[PDB]
């Protein structure tokens, strides 16, 4: 019985709390999306706009939690851009081996980072990110999938450093198990390719949903409350009316 524009009225404060805490670019994109919902003539329009803000906001809070830069989808590097810039000596072979799977070059993960060699972001340690993912999975039972490229049966070494990539997929959706299973299935082929190029990559995927206890998420609890008080209620009010 409530107009959608009126639904956005009741959740003014929840959504203002949300927009204030998200990263800037993330906050702006979410705000535009929110005015699209307020000015949504159809019920499919509103729901589809609400779904985008669920994904965009959560990713903003994933970046905040991990002190990574939030990247708008439009500015996200592809795999090929990462091979081109981080492993330029192997890019030509990366192209030849992707002839039969050209969509590999265009895979665009949520986070495409490299180890600080000192638009691919850099991080202090890939193994530290992998370990903290594995810890929470082991400690709280949170489903992850995790794949590391490895040429033949090579050992790690202590006398030389190599460049390396961390590829991370995240998300906020009900089927947590299905998300990580399909993510690591998408990226398996490129892990195998990376092994044949002698390129070290780790792929991580994880997922939260609204039933995950608030202390157990991949984002800070404070961020869990902001999502549940805003984007989650908006989904409940859209249905009821």
């Amino acid at each position, epitope marked *: 019985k409530k107009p959608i524009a009126l639904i956005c009225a009741e959740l003014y404060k929840p959504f203002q709390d949300l927009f204030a805490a998200l990263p800037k670019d993330c906050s702006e994109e979410c705000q535009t999306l929110f005015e699209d919902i307020r000015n949504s003539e159809s019920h499919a329009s509103a729901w589809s706009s609400a779904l985008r803000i669920k994904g965009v906001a959560y990713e903003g809070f994933f970046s905040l939690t991990n002190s990574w830069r939030y990247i708008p989808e439009d500015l996200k590097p592809t795999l090929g851009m990462a091979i081109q810039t981080v492993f330029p000596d192997k890019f030509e072979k990366f192209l030849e081996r992707t002839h039969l799977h050209p969509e590999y070059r265009d895979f665009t993960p949520d986070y495409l980072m490299c180890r600080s060699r000192i638009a691919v972001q850099e991080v202090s340690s890939v193994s530290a990110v992998v370990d903290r993912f594995k810890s929470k999975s082991s400690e709280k039972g949170r489903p992850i999938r995790q794949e590391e490229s490895r040429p*033949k049966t*090579e*050992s790690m*070494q*202590e*006398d*030389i450093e190599v460049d390396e990539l961390l590829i991370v997929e995240v998300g906020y959706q009900t089927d947590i198990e299905g998300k990580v299973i399909s993510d690591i299935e998408k990226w398996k082929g490129v892990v195998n390719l990376m092994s044949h190029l*002698g390129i070290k990559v780790n792929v991580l995927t994880c997922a939260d949903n609204s039933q995950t206890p608030r202390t157990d998420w991949w984002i800070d609890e404070k961020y869990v409350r902001l999502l549940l008080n805003s984007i989650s209620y908006l989904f409940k009010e859209l249905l009821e009316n």
Partner: antibody, heavy 118, light 113 residues
Framework: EVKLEESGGGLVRPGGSRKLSCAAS????????MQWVRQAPEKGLEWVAY????????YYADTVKGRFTISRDNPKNTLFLQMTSLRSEDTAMYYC???????????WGQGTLVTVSA | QIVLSQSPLSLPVSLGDQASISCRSS???????????LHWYLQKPGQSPKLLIY???NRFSGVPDRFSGSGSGTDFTLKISRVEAEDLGVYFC?????????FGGGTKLEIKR
């Protein structure tokens, strides 16, 4: 001078268990991977296990997988090998070793004898 | 599962002559990082092994310079330019490019008399 000193060898019944230690001195132990190598009497060398400086990466020879555990205590400059379900074929001199900068065996201990027999 | 094949099994050599010991690998030991982790050790009777050569041709610090190593890919050679009495023992090659790290079977250097 770099030195590695194994202890803990001795006699074990088949199926029994034994923990070896290796004390390291003369270098910054906590920055380097450490290894166990063994040699059965009158035979050649046989690699056993590797553990990275931060214990993040561990490798095992297939003949000890699921029976041996390699670990370390960096504040104590000590490398460990926990042996279980021991068999007569594990009778060997056990050496701990390190590359002090790589995965080769640059420094070796004097070794400690484990005899598995009833 | 790299298999390292040493030849000869035993090498009698006169004092002052050269010795040459071969180590063949079942696959290439070139690591993707560009290094080749093939190394050479000597075990004197009743002592623990000693490193001689690491990564094909790097003589370990303090090892006498009569010892040298060469090779690439799957074919490697340890040479003793002028054999001395203290060189009696069993020479091993070993690789650490792939897990498991593996050893050759040993070459027994014998002093000719």
């Amino acid at each position: 001078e770099v030195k590695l000193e194994e202890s803990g060898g001795g006699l074990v019944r088949p199926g029994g268990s034994r923990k070896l230690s290796c004390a390291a001195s003369g270098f910054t132990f906590s920055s380097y991977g450490m290894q166990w190598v063994r040699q059965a009497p009158e035979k050649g060398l046989e690699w056993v296990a590797y553990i990275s400086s931060g214990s993040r990466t561990i490798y095992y020879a297939d003949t000890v997988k699921g029976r041996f555990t390699i670990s370390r205590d960096n504040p104590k400059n000590t490398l460990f090998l926990q042996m279980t379900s021991l068999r007569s074929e594990d009778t060997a001199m056990y050496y701990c070793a390190t590359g002090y900068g790589g995965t080769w065996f640059a420094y070796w201990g004097q070794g400690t004898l484990v005899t598995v027999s009833a | 599962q790299i298999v390292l094949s040493q030849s000869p099994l035993s090498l009698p050599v006169s004092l002052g002559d050269q010795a040459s010991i071969s180590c063949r690998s079942s696959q290439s030991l070139l690591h993707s990082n560009g290094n080749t982790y093939l190394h050479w050790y000597l075990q004197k009777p009743g002592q623990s092994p000693k490193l001689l050569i690491y990564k094909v041709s790097n003589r370990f610090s303090g090892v006498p310079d009569r010892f040298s190593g060469s090779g690439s890919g799957t074919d490697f050679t340890l040479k003793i330019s002028r054999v001395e009495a203290e060189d009696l023992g069993v020479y091993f090659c070993s690789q650490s490019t792939h897990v498991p790290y593996t050893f050759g079977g040993g070459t027994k250097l014998e002093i000719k008399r």
